[PDB]
Amino acid sequence: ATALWRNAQLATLNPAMDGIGAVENAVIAVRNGRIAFAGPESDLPDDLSTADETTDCGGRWITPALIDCHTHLVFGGNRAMEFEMRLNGATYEEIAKAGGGIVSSVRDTRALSDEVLVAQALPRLDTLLSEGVSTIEIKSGYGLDIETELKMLRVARRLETLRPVRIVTSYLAAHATPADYKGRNADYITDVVLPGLEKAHAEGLADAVDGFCEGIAFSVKEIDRVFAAAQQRGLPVKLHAEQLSNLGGAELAASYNALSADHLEYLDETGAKALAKAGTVAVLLPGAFYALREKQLPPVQALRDAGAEIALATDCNPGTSPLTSLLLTMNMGATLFRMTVEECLTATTRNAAKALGLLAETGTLEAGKSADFAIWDIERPAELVYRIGFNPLHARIFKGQKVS
Amino acid sequence: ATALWRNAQLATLNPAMDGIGAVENAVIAVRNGRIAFAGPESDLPDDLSTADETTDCGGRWITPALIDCHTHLVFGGNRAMEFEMRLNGATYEEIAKAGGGIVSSVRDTRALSDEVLVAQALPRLDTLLSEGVSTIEIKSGYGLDIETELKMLRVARRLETLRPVRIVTSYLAAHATPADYKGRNADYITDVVLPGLEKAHAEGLADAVDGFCEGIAFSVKEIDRVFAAAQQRGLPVKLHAEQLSNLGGAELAASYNALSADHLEYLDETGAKALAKAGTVAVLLPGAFYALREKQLPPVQALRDAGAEIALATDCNPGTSPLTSLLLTMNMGATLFRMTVEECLTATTRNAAKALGLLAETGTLEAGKSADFAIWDIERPAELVYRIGFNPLHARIFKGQKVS
Ligand SMILES: N=CN[C@@H](CCC(=O)O)C(=O)O
Ligand SMILES: [Cl-]
Ligand SMILES: [Fe+3]
Ligand SMILES: [Fe+3]
Ligand SMILES: [Mg+2]
């Protein structure tokens, strides 16, 4: 199966090229769902000059398909209630009393079947897909008991069978401490987190192991127990770090050569250097920053100076970032974090793929990788970061197949 | 022609009711594109018990169609270039040599034919319509000469003939001075604004007269000349006031019974009370606030205390607020301005209609009004304000006809 997409402008994001690796008057040759060639039409090899199908892109811009490397897309119910209450002046105690807080998502997730969780997640997944997103990371963490933590991963896997999308999962039992384990974090990790990890891996339900290292969650030492267990099984690790305070989570992740450290509002210069040194991706999440009304900005310049690679994701979840637009995410990255257009585009493609350990597989328009790309009805790539609440997608191609 | 909408929950926003006028197990009776009945299905009059059509809404929520009372939706080109340039550290002088600044929109709007402007606006209009919006206000203001200003109004009128939407226009020649009138605000008003208003009115192209009272634009005395002229021709006025400084534009607007005063970041107590006393709606625009990285928040509490009605709009424009989601606008209203869920829902329905002088015609699900409503896939109205970058619209009804 071969196909050609000619008369296009490519934003290859090939790391060997400057900027976003733009190629004018280009073509993408595809074979068996793989990129056989991506460059100047004048350089297309003879053996690739003909194909079963040919699409005239009319000079539109093509970028690698977008990637959302950090989401909690799977969960039951919503958290609109406390949102409204808080806006009415409700106290943290009053909301809790009313059933709000992370416990709300845990209860609603625990209460639903696989089938219903899939049903509730699809609208969110489709919203992302509609924007050209073809690779999405989904975490567990709204179960807090082995059975529910496992059910979440199961649902994530199932979603991949219902849509043309690449889904990777992250075991996140170490997200919070459930009620029946209050004040017993060590026992929680002993009875649920670790045993849950063994079980998830044995079923092939976990691609990576995540964690929440924060004063309101788990400590560096407690997360260390989890990462040690994952490392022994060959599972890559990632971590929600320095979101609400500076604890040293970023540094812990680096020492374990984690795929990424996410949030990072309170990350310091030492942590930034450590992440870069280890090749750990710094995932910034503007949605939560925005919704929580956070005042501490992540150290973008420090990351730049350290040579750390920055990614951007939606952190799509029910309580701190009910965001379902990665295009909007880029606009926030630029507007709120002052990231350049180049950084924003790289953050949702090349760096997003690296944060998932999929760079050799997808994320850029390079020969040898999966033919995953998005065709945009724009004159300039900057348009994808500039507009607020607009979708200029013209077409999405997943593994060489135009899907809609 | 008749039709019934059964098994639904209604958010009537009837001002005579508490909150957003919610009604459980309700029905909507439509007759000749008008609302004959809206309320408890048990209170439905026998003479309406039947109709040609009947729709089971499956328990979904219904709200009056959304209204965007402040937009510059019509314009040629885009401003993505300067957006990218600013983030790269480009200075105002460098952006100007590259063709940036409001002059870019004026140049592009002047160069494009009526047809092409209509075509470039359709995608923005359609994005809003896809969100349940059925009434949109469109301003001129990117021409700065009589012919282009009038062209903009004609384009706006024509858009209403291509989609099921109610469009109201605002003559905004008093937006800024073009290159040849810099330092000559007086002559600009004398040569373009006033004669232009006369011609616009003669052709029935302007539903209202707008203006920009600001340091970088027109003074209070200058806008007064324009409002005086609008009054003599029987046209209502509105004003972009107190956006960057406090000049007393809001008070001037109130003295003319302005439909609304818009932006208001720098509005003081005196001004807030003046708007309330005059019945002028306070239109807050979070998009521009967000994009400009504004530090001065509008006096939300002062407005509440003075009893001023608040509306929310996208201010959809190329340079300061390229926003095309009114749903996102409500979320920003809550997130950035701390407006309650009830204030946000009211801000895009009842108060928006009032901002346009159309409350007797639409904006609430009340008998006698136009049958304009949106059916949503939500469990609670709060969801429409709570989510970020999501569209739960099920169906849009315009003048009693199901369109989307
Ligand atoms: N809404 C819940 N998700 C959050 C949990 C953070 C917290 O417990 O404060 C998250 O993914 O980080
Ligand atoms: Cl074209
Ligand atoms: Fe998260
Ligand atoms: Fe405006
Ligand atoms: Mg095009």
Q: What are the Cα distances from residue B374, in Å, to A219, A347, B29, B379?
A: 48, 36, 15, 14
Query: What DSSP designation does B178 have?
Result: -
In this structure, the number of other CB atoms found within 10 A of the CB of residue A336 comes to: 18
A78: domain CATH number? 3.20.20.140
| Neighbouring residues of B232: CB distance < 8 A, sequence distance ≥ 6 | none
* Token couple for B234: 């029987």
Residues A186 and A332 grouped into a single domain: yes
Q: Where are the alpha helices (DSSP H) in B164-285?
A: 185-188, 194-202, 220-232, 249-255, 269-278
Cβ-contact B172, B159 below 8 angstroms = no
Residues A45 and A124 grouped into a single domain: no
Distance B73 CA to ligand 4 centre (A): 10
* Token couple for B322: 């390229």
Residues B210 and B296 grouped into a single domain: yes
Q: What are the Cα distances from residue B382, in Å, to A217, A340, B2, B397?
A: 29, 34, 31, 21
Cβ-contact B17, B30 below 8 angstroms = no
* Token couple for B319: 């340079």
- Owning domain of residue B50: 1-64+364-404
Following DSSP, what letter does each residue of A34-92 receive, concatenated?
EEEEEEEGGG--GGGS--SEEEE-TT-EEEEPEEE-------SS--HHHHHHHHTT--H
Amino acid residing at A402:
K
How many structural domains compose chain A? 2
3-class SS shares of chain A: helix, strand, coil, % to 5: 40, 20, 40
Cβ-contact A244, A265 below 8 angstroms = yes
* Token couple for A204: 């092939």
B285-301 in b/e burial notation, b at 16+ Cβ within 10 A? Answer: bbbbbbbeebeeebbbe
Q: Does A324 sit within 8 Å of B84, measured CB to CB? A: no
Following DSSP, what letter does each residue of A358-389 receive, concatenated?
-TTTSSS--TTSB--EEEE--SSTTHHHH-BS
Residues with CB under 6 A from ligand 1: A 72, 102, 105, 176, 216, 240, 317-320
Residues B24 and B150 grouped into a single domain: no
Residues A39 and A52 grouped into a single domain: yes
Query: Whole-angstrom Cα distance, residue A300 to residue A360?
Result: 26
Spell out the long-range contacts of B89-95 with Cβ–Cβ below 8 A and sequence spacing 24 or more.
none
In this structure, the number of other CB atoms found within 10 A of the CB of residue B45 comes to: 9
Nearest to A225 by CA among A178, A150, A171, A174: A174
- CB contacts of B322 in chain A (<8 Å) are 386-388, 390
Q: Does A385 sit within 8 Å of B84, measured CB to CB? A: yes
Nearest to A346 by CA among A5, A12, A9: A12
- CB contacts of B87 in chain A (<8 Å) are 334, 338-341
Q: Does B84 sit within 8 Å of A340, measured CB to CB? A: yes
Nearest to B6 by CA among B23, B22, B32, B29: B29
| Neighbouring residues of B233: CB distance < 8 A, sequence distance ≥ 6 | B197, B198, B201
- In the sheet where B133-139 sits, what is the strand order? B66-68, B133-139, B166-171, B208-209
CA of A317, closest atom in ligand 1: 1
**For residue B382, how far is the Cα from the chain centroid?**
21
Sign of the CA dihedral A256, A213, A238, B87? Answer: negative
Sign of the CA dihedral A354, A356, A360, A364? Answer: negative
Query: Whole-angstrom Cα distance, residue A347 to residue A276?
Result: 15
Placement of tokens 């560096």 in the chain: A220
Dihedrals φ, ψ of B117, to 5°?
Answer: -70, -40
B309 three-class SS: coil
Sign of the CA dihedral B330, B334, B339, B341? Answer: positive
Residues B336 and B386 grouped into a single domain: no
Q: Where are the alpha helices (DSSP H) in B98-140?
A: 102-111, 114-129
Which residue's CA is the closest to the ligand 1 atom numbered 2?
A: A319
Helix axes B194-202, B146-159, angle to 10 degrees: 40
Which of A68, A72, A87 has the most B C-beta neighbours within 10 Å, making it the best mutation to test the interface with B? Answer: A87
B103 three-class SS: helix
Amino acid residing at A296:
Q
Placement of tokens 């967000």 in the chain: B290
Query: Whole-angstrom Cα distance, residue A253 to residue A211?
Result: 10
A227-261 in b/e burial notation, b at 16+ Cβ within 10 A? Answer: bebbeeeebbbbbbbbbbebbbbbbbbbebebbbb
Cβ-contact B362, B67 below 8 angstroms = yes
**For residue B28, how far is the Cα from the chain centroid?**
26
Residues A202 and A337 grouped into a single domain: yes
- Residue to probe by mutation, ligand 1, list A137, A320, A321, A323, most atoms within 8 Å of CB: A320
Q: Where are the alpha helices (DSSP H) in B260-340?
A: 269-278, 286-292, 300-306, 326-337
Following DSSP, what letter does each residue of A173-220 receive, concatenated?
-TT---GGGTT-HHHHIIIIIHHHHHHHHHTT--SEE--EESTTSB-H
Cβ-contact A199, A146 below 8 angstroms = yes
A110-134 in b/e burial notation, b at 16+ Cβ within 10 A? Answer: bebeeeebbebbeebbebbbbbbbb
- CB contacts of A341 in chain B (<8 Å) are 83-84, 87-88
Q: Does A87 sit within 8 Å of B334, measured CB to CB? A: yes
Dihedrals φ, ψ of B165, to 5°?
Answer: -155, 150
Residues A368 and A272 grouped into a single domain: no
Determine how β-strand B393-398 pairs with β-strand B401-402: antiparallel
Residues A245 and A345 grouped into a single domain: yes
Nearest to B263 by CA among B239, B245, B285: B285
Cβ-contact A34, A369 below 8 angstroms = yes
Residues A12 and A147 grouped into a single domain: no
Residues B18 and B156 grouped into a single domain: no
**For residue A260, how far is the Cα from the chain centroid?**
10
Option in A79, A328, A340 nearest B389 (CB): A328
Residues A395 and A370 grouped into a single domain: yes
| Neighbouring residues of A209: CB distance < 8 A, sequence distance ≥ 6 | A170, A171, A172, A197, A226, A227, A229, A230, A235, A236, A237, A238
B14: domain CATH number? 2.30.40.10
Please tell me the experimental approach by which this structure was elucidated.
X-ray
- In the sheet where A208-209 sits, what is the strand order? A66-68, A133-139, A166-171, A208-209
